[PDB]
Amino acid sequence: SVLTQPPSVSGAPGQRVTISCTGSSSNIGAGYDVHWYQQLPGTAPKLLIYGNSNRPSGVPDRFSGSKSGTSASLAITGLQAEDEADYYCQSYDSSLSGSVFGGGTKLTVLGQPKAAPSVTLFPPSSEELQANKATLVCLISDFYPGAVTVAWKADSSPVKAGVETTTPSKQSNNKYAASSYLSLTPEQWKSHRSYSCQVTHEGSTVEKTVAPT
Amino acid sequence: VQLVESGAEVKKPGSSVKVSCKASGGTFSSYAISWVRQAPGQGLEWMGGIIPILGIANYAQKFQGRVTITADKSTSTAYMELSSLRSEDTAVYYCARENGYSGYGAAANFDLWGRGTLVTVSSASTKGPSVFPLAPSSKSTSGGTAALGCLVKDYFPEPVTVSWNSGALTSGVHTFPAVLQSSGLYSLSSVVTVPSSSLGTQTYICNVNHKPSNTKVDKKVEPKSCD
Amino acid sequence: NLCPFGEVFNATRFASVYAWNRKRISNCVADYSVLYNSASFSTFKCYGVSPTKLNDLCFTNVYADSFVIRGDEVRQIAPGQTGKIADYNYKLPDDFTGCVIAWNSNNLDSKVGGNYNYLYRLFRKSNLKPFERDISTEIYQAGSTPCNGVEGFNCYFPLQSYGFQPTNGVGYQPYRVVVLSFELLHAPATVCG
Amino acid sequence: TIEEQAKTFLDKFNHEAEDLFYQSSLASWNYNTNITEENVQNMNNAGDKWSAFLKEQSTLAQMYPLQEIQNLTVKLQLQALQQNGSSVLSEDKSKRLNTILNTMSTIYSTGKVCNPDNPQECLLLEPGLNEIMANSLDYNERLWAWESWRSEVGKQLRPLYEEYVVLKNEMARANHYEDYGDYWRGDYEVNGVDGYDYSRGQLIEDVEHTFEEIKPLYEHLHAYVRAKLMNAYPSYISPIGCLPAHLLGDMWGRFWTNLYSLTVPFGQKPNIDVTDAMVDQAWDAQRIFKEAEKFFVSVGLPNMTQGFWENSMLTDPGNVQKAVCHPTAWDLGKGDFRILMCTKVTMDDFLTAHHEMGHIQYDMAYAAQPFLLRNGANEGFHEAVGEIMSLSAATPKHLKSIGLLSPDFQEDNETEINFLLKQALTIVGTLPFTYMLEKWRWMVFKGEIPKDQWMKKWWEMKREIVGVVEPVPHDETYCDPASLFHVSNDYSFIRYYTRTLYQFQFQEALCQAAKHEGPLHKCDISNSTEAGQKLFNMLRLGKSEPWTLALENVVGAKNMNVRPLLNYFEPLFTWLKDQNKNSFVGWSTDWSPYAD
Ligand SMILES: *[C@@H]1O[C@H](CO)[C@@H](O)[C@H](O)[C@H]1NC(C)=O
Ligand SMILES: *[C@@H]1O[C@H](CO)[C@@H](O)[C@H](O)[C@H]1NC(C)=O
Ligand SMILES: *[C@@H]1O[C@H](CO)[C@@H](O)[C@H](O)[C@H]1NC(C)=O
Ligand SMILES: *[C@@H]1O[C@H](CO)[C@@H](O)[C@H](O)[C@H]1NC(C)=O
Ligand SMILES: [Zn+2]
């Protein structure tokens, strides 16, 4: 929108990370208050800072706002775990004649314990060939959403059709699992000799190949 | 107070929606009521707002005629009309409260927010889902464990409850979400972990219930004989 | 380069008088002689600065405050004037050093059936400082009875609706009123002529 | 702190009532120019919204007390806002009352008379019965028309009129008033201002004291017209008795101008008439309104809005649609002003247009005042203001100044007498009827007369006060006073009595302010800017100030008087005195044409 924010800000636990909103002269430089909004992931947004310097009830003292000239600033004195959110600045505009929000600022607190990705390849069964469709699945477990790139190959050329990436879901042991899909045809299923699933994660690559015949 | 919104429905190109809002304990007065949607990953912008007592609404520039917003103060509610539904109109809508003030600036700030109504537009037609079994091969069962499950094809919408032996299995079960395809088709996956000693005495079946389609298929899984 | 002024005056929807559209003009050259030579406005009164010698002088920043009022409160927009709109919506200070422009727009801010799109503030607990906006919709408590947000006895809403219609007289027709304010603070000049 | 709550409530009422009144006036103007069923539906729904809003706002106002506010204007607004009327009773009684009023309206509007030769041929009341009553030279025909009109409506209205009277009396008794006459007379009461109080009995005593002064001017005119009808009809009226009932020009005896041609004293000198002068010069309503605007702006009064000049009608477009051919003005508010004026190339239409222009100028005078500071404490100020300008525009000097009348027309001692007689035939002649009707209605609403002597008292007071004989006795089965337009739709009639003196008081004030020491009938108020400004200073006030002060700051009198009325017709009074040197002056109450 007209109000510009950084796409994301790195998070240092226990230090200050300043989130800015450099708007135009008709929205922030005009004199309208810059209301700072914070939305938790999978949660409805709520009012974080209002009146451009004042704090609503139920808001921690760590979040404080300040605007000078045509730019606003959000001060975060303390960085804890639940500060993972996207921050929006909202101000009234004269040319637009209405309240407009910003682009969002993803405050990402650091953390990364992981392990090697374990993948399993399940070949299609016999009864699926009579449905005039061929499906190839790639079950991957004990991995992280970072570096979830999935590649397909048939020992002669990579496959650039029917490949998608699915967002993983949280398990009950602080783990995430996902899968990738591939739509094909049983007519060309027997033409290729073998099929393999390629997953790249932090430079660790594992290969699994199934044999239809 | 708390604001209650409707559930999620799928929609079609054209047509209209009737997103509503309801404030618990009354207090739907002396305060403007604005509607803000949350686009899926591209931000939020303001549809419009009504001063409910005066019965006069205002709109934005990109949504002045496409969107119509109405209020009813007797039952403490507001009805949102959104005609001409396309693909970029798929988002989640929130009914936010307004807290006007006399501060020099005096900018509109949203104090209270609703639950959120997810509206999506899809051209998928209702059809019959197809379920096929999956069984591991000889090389897959290197150890004492085996992996098998059931997959769903040609199904809509995405809410589907997959139960193992009518809920008799609770350990090792995992549910996977779908992903957008070229033709707008969705497909999920489901796997379980079982020992190899129970593959010759106990069979595994999948029970899939589809409430809108009024169908329920019972299918068996039998391990591969060639490998 | 020319300051953006055409889209301010040719705006499709001017803001209401309780929440007026405020714009900042800077870092360009603004020829105020175009507005005077066009003479398309009924009101061109400018206190605090001469109606002609403001063009060649250099200022720092310009504030534009646009709103729509009826006919007989154009007189109310002046330093020292009081009223239900000139005090409760936009109180022009006694040391005003700019100009106020008002023109008739009955063909664009009114239609048949009654145009209620423009609002105004009617009741306030006290006065307002100059250059202050009040968008508070909290019910004005008249008497000692606290209604706690329920409309009733000794409780009336501050914000009412206007009566803009194209078949009314010039005293109740929608007039688009903009306010230009010049600040001469300890800053270098950015706008000239 | 009560008074500031009252001011806030009054401001809220002013804004919302201005909006709703503009909407209802818009609906009414849409109906009266484009008559169709959905226009009637628009009037009905707009009136229902207006009535409901007024009802609930008046309840909220009546909830407030009245003994802690000394603010005069606030007190006046509260008094004029705390009004219930027929809503003080139950729902069934109010529905019965307004159903009775609707039956009054329907029976009065649906008035037809059929010839005895064949029942198919019938003539309505407004389009034609008034025409044949105005243009008739026969005694038997007018007698038959009177009998056919008042022998079939009274029989169906008499118990209905009794029900209306008793319902109005009950509603007046339920509103802390002794009678409906007291409720109507309370509109002139002033409360709060010291030294300017006005009760309901002093008005009656002053009306009687002015009526005993208008009696010598009325009995001479009665003797003159009796002599004229004797000369025209020797075997139909004797100059010992009273005037015939149906020989009063019009049907109700209000305007006697229908027999002006029969009662011309000097037929040799041509009467003033510029109808050919506007016919041969291609004069339309546009030119008439332009010259009237020039005359109104030449005396200091501000001119009309463009709204009147573009939105209001002044001509009907053929027979493709029907419009109301009746003068009625609307103050729509918010600077919107409109008027129905059925224009033809005549002089009566010219005077009616000037009267309605005076009406809308008075409406524009108190433009800045709120809806509770609207038109004044009486409904005769506007009539007087319109008619004084109408008569000023009809003076021979005004006609000669605009180039209409030829300057060679002399002003001798005969044309002025004819003009004075014409003015008194429509101004003086309605005062006894107005006073009689108001006094009679007062005693009916007070209850001093039983239900078996209403006709007896009405005809006894008709044979004495007005002095009109009846060609045939009538029993109690009829209701003749229930055949008036102002009595069948619930409007007061004392307004005409007040404006009859108000017009002459205003005319004398303007002629004195214009420094005109000559005769009053030749006085002209053109070119007078100071008199126009002085008049506008009172026109702007409206009902915010008492009518006593509004008369004191104009004519210098707190109470009305017949001094300008007697001074205006002084040459006519002397002419009636010296011409009636051999004719009997007065009338006898023991004369009856059916007893011969
Ligand atoms: C008058 O009423 C008729 C009814 O159909 C409508 O067609 C016409 O447009 C109206 N004209 C005006 C000037 O309101
Ligand atoms: C009635 O109150 C208003 C508002 O305070 C005041 O202006 C006015 O003068 C008062 N009326 C009189 C007769 O003093
Ligand atoms: C005022 O006096 C002038 C003097 O000649 C005259 O022409 C004009 O008609 C007068 N005004 C009116 C309204 O008669
Ligand atoms: C009223 O008279 C003034 C001059 O006194 C004139 O300028 C104005 O145009 C007139 N109004 C109209 C509607 O013609
Ligand atoms: Zn009249």
Numbering used by the authors:
A (entry chain L): 2 to 214
B (entry chain H): 2 to 228
C (entry chain E): 334 to 526
D (entry chain A): 20 to 615
Sentences from the study reporting this entry:
The HCDR3 epitope contains mostly polar residues—R466, I468, S469 and T470; this epitope interacts with HCDR3 via extensive hydrogen bonding (right). HCDR2 being hydrophobic is the defining feature of VH1-69 antibodies and HCDR2 residues are known to be polymorphic. Consequently, these antibodies feature a ~120° rotation in binding orientation such that their light chains are orientated to clash with ACE2 binding and their epitopes are fully exposed. These analyses reveal that the hydrophobic HCDR2 epitope can serve as an anchor point to support two different binding modes of VH1-69 antibodies. Although it has been proposed that L452R may improve other aspects of spike function, thereby increasing virus infectivity, we identified that recurrent substitutions at, or around position 452, affect binding of commonly induced VH1-69 antibodies, in particular R1-32-like antibodies.
